[PDB]
Design a protein around this nucleic acid. Sequence first.
RNA 1: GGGAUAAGUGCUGAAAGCAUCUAAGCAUGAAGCCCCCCUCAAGAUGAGAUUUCCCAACUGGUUAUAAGAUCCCUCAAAG
RNA 2: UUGGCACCUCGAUGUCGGCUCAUCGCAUCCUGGGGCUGUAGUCGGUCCCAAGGGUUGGGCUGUUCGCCCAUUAAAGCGGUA
RNA 3: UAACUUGGGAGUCAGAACAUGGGUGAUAAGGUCCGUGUUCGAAAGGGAAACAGCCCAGACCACCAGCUAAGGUCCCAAAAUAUAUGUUAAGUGGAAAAGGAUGUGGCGUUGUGACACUGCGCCGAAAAUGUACCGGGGCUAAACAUAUUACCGAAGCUGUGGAUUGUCCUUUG
Lengths: 100, 37, 53, 143, 50
Amino acid sequence: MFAIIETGGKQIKVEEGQEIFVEKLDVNEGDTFTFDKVLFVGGDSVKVGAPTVEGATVTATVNKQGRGKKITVFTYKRRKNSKRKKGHRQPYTKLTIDKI
Amino acid sequence: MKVRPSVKPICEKCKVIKRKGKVMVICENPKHKQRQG
Amino acid sequence: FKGQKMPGRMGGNTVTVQNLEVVQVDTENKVILVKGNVPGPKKGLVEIRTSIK
Amino acid sequence: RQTFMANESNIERKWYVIDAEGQTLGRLSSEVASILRGKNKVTYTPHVDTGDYVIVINASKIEFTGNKETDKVYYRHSNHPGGIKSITAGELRRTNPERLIENSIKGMLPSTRLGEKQGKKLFVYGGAEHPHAAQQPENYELR
Amino acid sequence: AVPKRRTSKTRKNKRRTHFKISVPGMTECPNCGEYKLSHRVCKNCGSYNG
RNA sequence: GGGAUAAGUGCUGAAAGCAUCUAAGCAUGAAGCCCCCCUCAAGAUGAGAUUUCCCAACUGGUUAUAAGAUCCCUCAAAG
RNA sequence: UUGGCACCUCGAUGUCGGCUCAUCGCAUCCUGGGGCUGUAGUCGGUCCCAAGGGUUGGGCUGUUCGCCCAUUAAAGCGGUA
RNA sequence: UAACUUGGGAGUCAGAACAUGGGUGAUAAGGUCCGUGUUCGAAAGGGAAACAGCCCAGACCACCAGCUAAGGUCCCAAAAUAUAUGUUAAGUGGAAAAGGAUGUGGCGUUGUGACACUGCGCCGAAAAUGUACCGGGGCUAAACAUAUUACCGAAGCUGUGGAUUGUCCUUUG
């Protein structure tokens, strides 16, 4: 009994009791959150998929809301005195999938 | 035996043939045989 | 290029001579007399056989 | 995220045996190289050989097309000055067919450290008898 | 000639792989009680007795 | 001395009722090709093979020992 | 080969000819195999396949090339800074 | 949705290839000189094997999402051993002429012979370290000609989140 949820312009194969990591959602720490973009459900249970299954949904607890590891964005043009350094901590939110 | 890039019948009993993908000229007068068309 | 002739260690190869003849097979002294002079030093092992030609 | 990668304990490997009678050399070699690298199976990952072991038999019976027996000179250089060697496919088919098919297939696998592992999973015999009875080889037909 | 490129301190140690010196090949003297070097006179006390 | 061949010479034969060494098919034909002759070669990691020898005492493994090879010494046909 | 251009090298890419050592191409000088000859034979001429091996020693000139001498089966033509 | 003016500040005055109109040269040159354009200069990404200038396309940053561009789908190497109809036997494809020639297909005109145009092929076709003019294997279809689909394919576009500049106030958002 898994599913495929469309969350942030990306699909995710999700089973229960699993912790998942998604782009930033507006909710705060420790909250429920219902996924509606579910395109395909069921493993050993059933195999039903439409553009969106439209009968099934998912519910997750908003476990945490943070920022990934700072990747430094460095790059340069050789012999032409041009270089550029940036930083980036892409923000994420981690969720526990409570029910399907 | 003439080996030149233009074989054409000289006297009216010389006949053009092919052999091994080469254009030959068989002829009774033995001067008149040619190949490499 | 490989095969360029350069200084290095010389001699010691397994060389073969051919078409020698047998002047005399001295039995009871157990020697053979061959026409010529064969590879190897004195006391050097030599294997004699019949010509391949 | 989630993308299954093949490990040493995930992988399986199977034994196939393909008649090389009546097949064009390259039309068969492509199929065989596909099998060797291992992308007939869904657990394909690049950094490991999830492919199979293959036993090509009847290598003294492959067919060329057109004037390729007398043409199609195989060359090889000995790295000595001026020493280049040659052999036509007709003379390599009667003298050593098990090198004909091997060279065809191994030119279609990558030249890497893992491509040589896969390169030495090919077992080519000129004949109908292969000594790998103890391996449970399977039939295989050209897809 | 002169070196075209300075030698790493890896290639150096590889080349000095064989810069060992073996032990001498010694034994113990049955008379002196101590280590001598084989086929030599005993350093400590006297005799060879060979 | 062979086996396959280049130029070459053909033999049979239609395409083309004939002619035709060629398309099917079959012969012959070079100091040249591959052999044969000489050597090196299993690090040929595709690591081949034949013969002979050796093989026990304790705690999952280890030990010294065996057959064997050396350290050390006298040397040269080797360096 | 004689040139044309001026693209690399002027904080350096050393000249011609010999000596040592060669290696490659074939547009073959000899030796091997053929066709045609205005090829009687010997001896040739001109094409065709062929690169396995061989291809001299002196005089004169810095000399290369070049002429001469005495032979040879032959005294090849080129590339590799 | 730029333009001009008046001010402060500069840099540039060695240009290159590609297409094209010319001069010069020899209807030589990656030659040289000018008109027009593009790119490089100062431009990363994909294709051309490798390759500033060739074809596609302009990188704010993250993403293990989707759609296309030149170019491609037998294997190396992602996606058609797709589809319908024909041509080519040379490995042509995958270096080159004058000229030669019962190669072969189309089409038309002609008295089984002869002809004009044509499609694709053959010969002409010889160089030096090593095959060595498809990138390699290999190919008789995995080559050509015309038409249908599918798909792969970029840092292009889209989706999501984020960061700085702006302009409009729906509601200073």
